Ligand binder design. Structure first.
Ligand SMILES: O=c1[nH]c(=O)c2nn[nH]c2[nH]1
Ligand SMILES: O=c1[nH]c(=O)c2nn[nH]c2[nH]1
Ligand SMILES: O=c1[nH]c(=O)c2nn[nH]c2[nH]1
Ligand SMILES: O=c1[nH]c(=O)c2nn[nH]c2[nH]1
Ligand code: NA
Ligand code: NA
Ligand code: NA
Ligand code: NA
Lengths: 295, 295, 295, 295
């Protein structure tokens, strides 16, 4: 037998950082969960019990805190790139670092219509994520994403004209509820190294904001023919607004809300035009994916 | 042996309702999870296999949907009171209904700075809940609550002057992070029946809003001496603003964020005044509770 | 306003302890999650910011580890009683301790049909729990429980003869699936203090084992007329086998598995006698509770 | 823009099937959660709102139940292969099916030392999974796995001789706790189609059993030099025992249990040789992966 692939590191490293503006007194907080996995010339730790090649996962944890102390942690694309580059430059035998960061929302509180200097609220479990792969000799690959954005529209969704055969019971519809949890990823063109990532720093937050805005607007305004057709519209727009993106991927559950026939009870009318009370279904759910790139 | 207490019913009943304003085209959605448990003269179902006394839990489920179809579902205090009263009036041998409702957030989307007629976002997993106990001959008891409100302040929290003995290692501090998930419950004075609950309908949303506002403002503005002292301030204010409330209960975890000493690494300064990077602790956590009533 | 009730302490304290038999080399592990909440003369911490009355929750955490170091951690009824008694005896102004312990399964591995001296498997998320309330002057109240015991029988469950009215759609049945997660609690007669708890030590594990055995046997062998009737049979037997128990409480979800009509597809027969494939329902679920005591 | 990749289908389809032996009266239950995603000539559903190419996800759900009604559901490798082949043969324009199945444990109860004909217990949340990719013209690729197997050994684990530099604080150790949740996957050689999968049917359960046995024995018996070295030993053995496997992949968290220094309290000795009480750490955790194939 032979080691065909190997990677190891530290997962679920929770990190908080505060920035204090001495002039204004305003404080800003960042909280993330970080995972770093390394690859390189480490096969002998598996095959020969040679621990000399192992940078201990505990040390990886220390390095994350030290790096957060000495560098900005925002945008996460930059922090992840710094963190990954560290490992491949510091250790001769480590040739790739894989850094995943999940950013948690701490949104500044408004009290009496003014932003509070040091108090924050978690408004939703929506996340902003990055995956950064730093590979010696092959630059920096960054996939940015948002996830956990849960939305619902109560009308202006349709689904008709699908294939019908002996396995089909679903009725065509011209008015249904559509609800999903959005997972959207945009993949950046490969960067040559940290200097290049640094040069594009302002684009990271801007492109996240654009992705979020396009998602919300398109969902709200499209008279949707299907989840497939609506998601494609979103992806198309994001690619149009940022030329440094190569592909956009969406993965969307179709979280079903079923009509409830109540006609058995006193002829009560609760279907079609008369539908008011629905039963949200926890499972199963549709799952629709697409990756859109440039012609 | 003897049956000392018994209750049975249906849990985890997910319900969605939409309201459509025909004049304006605006739609408003409500989504809840409902639990209804009944008590009464039902001992024989346990002791003698006498199912004749059982209103089937499946029927309870049907009744929830039917009741939602024929009545407003907001405020939840009113809906719960209608639902519970139904069971004790319909069935001679059922003498108490216990209704728990969890309300899920569907917040109307703003697109291009205007509120959208039919699109919604789940902004946070914060819930508004009610517990309604309808007891034949003893009126309607309602406990209203908010839960899952997660907040953090980065300074203006202290903790010093606590008891110190041979079990104590905690250092006194004049500046720490304070973060919690707020669970706040206000218990209404007993209501004589549905007519009385109906008479106070506007107070339900108003008091929820007040509880939320007082919680957020006090947390943000109190230079906190402890979780105990800050929570008492919140409870005191709520009782002052609504005379129909008898008690207010808060249950607050103290979600710890620990300093990380980095001095072992190149004398790096990250404690006390120099603390910037912290380690959020998943467990253990402090848990502090209090119930405040009137003198 | 006035403090009507208050309690505070440390939740989610994870503890592991190992015992090493030097003679045989056999090691035995225990893992628990502990919560300790105190009550007493502590109102001034809430009302006047008087921290002098506060035994810090961090100190409570230390005390749990120290107590585990110096005492047996099994049975949990004994450990909880020691832990709670500590607080009320050590601190003059603390008058009640509330100790909750969840015990996690670490079951010794059998390798090649022999028990391994130091390797363990988590066989299921079933828990053994205790709630111990130690109140100055009022002795020690102990509620023991098992939870998370998930079972299913594929036949020998019935449900017919329930009330039928205009809210009823459920068909009577003489053969259905029954599946539940068992939560069973037995409440001990009040103990005067630690000496008395110590005197009954062997009864704790024995009664847990009996409760578990009676639950499993009755579930498997009863041709069940309802969840109500079957659970009563369980409770009756436990009370008969241990005279130091005052009440037994069961709380049982009815986790529904629905028939799937497939007759629309090529007349395929999958209902009643021909039912083979079913759809497990995640929600809603029935919830049935009962507390049984002595005549 | 252009569609670069697309797949869609139904996730979280819960399925139960019962088998009844009429001769013996013995019943056997199977419960699974199934996900089916299709690929093929479906781009126009995204780009042109052409639903004619869509086999509705609701129909996919129906097909899963129908297929379960007419075929054995065990071993899951066979069921997944039947299910996937169905889609690529039935629909001209569908060219790949991706089937994921998670199998839930229902273990027959022993009552009074005899196996019960129709009662079952969920002994642990360990799963047996399959991923089956059926691609028109390219046969059937099957990855089988076990997951959620949680184990702990209290001694006979070491970790010393790792790299030490200015980022390192971890002390070398010759005796520590090792605990993990095992995720192990074995990838079968490509199969030409259903006939070939059918021919190897007995190997599927046998190889699952072997993987499980080798995992447990090696974990229990290896005086482990590291997680890396122990996992390699497991993978090597599995490959040796089944020639139709091409690679074995393990992904193992290192779930840390920390010593607790109690010397501050009355000189209490709880570290090194004297360590008895430990603090299980929920996060962070090491994460170690490896893929082993043939020379
Ligand atoms: O088994 C281990 N492998 C590792 O890579 C490691 N790093 N810290 N502790 C460790 N333990
Ligand atoms: O065992 C049962 N008890 C009940 O109360 C019930 N209601 N519907 N189905 C039921 N099954
Ligand atoms: O606000 C706090 N209250 C307490 O009771 C406590 N105990 N430790 N830290 C604490 N912080
Ligand atoms: O938007 C949808 N896309 C689909 O593929 C589908 N299948 N059933 N319902 C559906 N809705
Ligand atoms: Na390198
Ligand atoms: Na009544
Ligand atoms: Na006392
Ligand atoms: Na095909």
């Amino acid at each position: 037998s032979a080691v065909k692939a190997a990677r190891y590191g530290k997962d679920n490293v929770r990190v908080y950082k505060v920035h204090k503006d001495e002039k204004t007194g305003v404080q800003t907080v960042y909280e993330m969960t970080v995972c770093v996995l390394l690859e390189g010339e480490i096969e002998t730790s598996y095959t020969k019990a040679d621990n000399s090649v192992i940078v201990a996962t505990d040390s990886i944890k220390n390095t994350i805190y030290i790096t957060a102390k000495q560098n900005p942690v925002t945008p996460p694309e930059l922090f992840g790139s710094i963190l990954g580059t560290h490992f491949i430059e510091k250790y001769n035998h480590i040739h790739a670092a894989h850094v995943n960061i999940v950013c948690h929302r701490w949104t500044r509180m408004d009290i009496d219509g003014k932003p509070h200097p040091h108090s924050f609220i978690r408004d939703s479990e929506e996340k902003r994520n990055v995956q950064v792969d730093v590979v010696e000799g092959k630059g920096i690959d960054i996939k940015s994403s948002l996830s956990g954005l849960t939305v619902l529209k109560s009308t202006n969704s349709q689904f008709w004209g699908f294939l019908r055969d002996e396995y089909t019971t679903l009725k065509e519809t011209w008015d249904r509820i559509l609800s999903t949890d959005v997972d959207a990823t945009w993949q950046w063109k490969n960067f040559s190294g940290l200097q290049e990532v640094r040069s594009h720093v302002p684009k990271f937050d801007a492109t996240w904001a654009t992705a979020r805005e396009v998602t919300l607007k398109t969902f709200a305004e499209d008279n949707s023919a299907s989840v497939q057709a609506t998601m494609y519209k979103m992806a198309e727009q994001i690619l149009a607004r940022q030329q440094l993106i190569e592909t956009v991927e969406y993965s969307l559950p179709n979280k079903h809300y079923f009509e409830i026939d109540l006609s058995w009870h006193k002829g009560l009318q609760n279907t079609g035009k008369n539908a008011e009370v629905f039963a949200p279904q926890s499972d199963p759910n549709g799952l629709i994916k697409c990756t859109v790139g440039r012609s």
